[PDB]
């Protein structure tokens, strides 16, 4: 749970001001709950974690070495084209998951801000619009048979248009 990734803003908790001559039910209710339910559950969790630690196991994260790109890849030849296209599919999937992360953080921020979502929930919306212009200019009109070649054609046509605009 990378907190640098998921902010989890602070929690400005309020204080209790029970000004009356009657007792708070939640006090006794939650006390009895935390008493009867959490006790056995917590003991069992400790048991499980101890068994874990005694028969521990590890697993790593796969690091995919990099390779040349479609550019430095002669037409007709394939081996290169394949070792580039699969890398590109990996990048595509990673960008999609990034989009998911942004959306999740956004919904969080929204709810956690409540009715003030129009003022304090505008920062993340800007990251969203920017990231989304990127994902658009990259992967908008490819087609289910998408691939590095079509993405490159997109990039190149867009570059040509921008450059013609600049020159006039």
């Amino acid at each position: 749970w990378d907190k640098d990734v998921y902010p989890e803003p602070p929690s400005r908790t309020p204080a209790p001001s029970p000004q009356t001559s009657l007792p708070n039910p939640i006090t006794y209710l939650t006390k009895a709950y935390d008493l009867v339910v959490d006790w056995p559950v917590t003991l069992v969790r400790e048991f499980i974690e101890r068994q874990h630690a005694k028969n521990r196991t590890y697993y790593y994260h796969r690091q995919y070495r990099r390779v040349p790109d479609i550019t430095e890849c002669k037409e007709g030849d394939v081996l290169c084209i394949y070792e580039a296209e699969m890398q590109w599919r990996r990048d595509f999937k990673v960008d999609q998951e990034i989009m998911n992360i942004i959306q999740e953080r956004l919904k969080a921020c929204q709810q956690r801000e409540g009715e003030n979502y129009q003022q304090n929930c505008a920062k993340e919306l800007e990251q969203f619009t920017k990231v989304t212009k990127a994902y658009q200019d990259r992967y908008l009109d490819l087609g289910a048979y998408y691939s590095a070649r079509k993405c490159l054609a997109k990039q190149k046509q867009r570059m040509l248009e921008e450059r013609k605009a600049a020159r006039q």
Partner: protein, 125 residues
């Protein structure tokens, strides 16, 4: 007062052709009765027929299905208003929908070529 219709037929009583006292028409009614009674009796000599291990066959049902399913093309004779309704149902609506879709797509295409249509958030399509 009241008028007929294709839905709300003229009920039994009000029908002028009823209350007739024609001997020929009453005889036709009694002939219908003879027919229906013969049918019901032939049916009841099987509904209760013991030693039976099967069901009944409804030849009216079978003939109705035949006439709705397979007796069609043989007795079918092409004529106008028929060829016409067919060509209509087979051509008209397809082409209407098609003009609609083509106009819409060309609108969208020229709009984008201009570079206007707000496509923000259309990331998945």
């Amino acid at each position: 007062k009241y008028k007929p219709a294709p839905l709300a037929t003229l009920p039994s009583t009000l029908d002028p052709a009823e209350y007739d006292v024609s001997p020929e028409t009453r005889r036709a009614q009694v002939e219908r009765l003879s027919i229906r009674a013969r049918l019901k009796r032939e049916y009841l000599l099987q509904y209760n027929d013991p030693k039976r291990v099967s069901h009944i066959e409804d030849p009216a049902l079978i003939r109705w299905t035949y006439a709705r399913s397979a007796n069609i093309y043989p007795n079918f004779r092409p004529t106008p208003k028929n060829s016409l309704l067919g060509a209509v149902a087979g051509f008209g609506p397809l082409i209407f929908w098609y003009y609609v879709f083509k106009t819409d797509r060309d609108r969208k295409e020229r709009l984008i070529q201009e570079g206007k249509l707000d496509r923000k958030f259309n990331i998945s399509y």
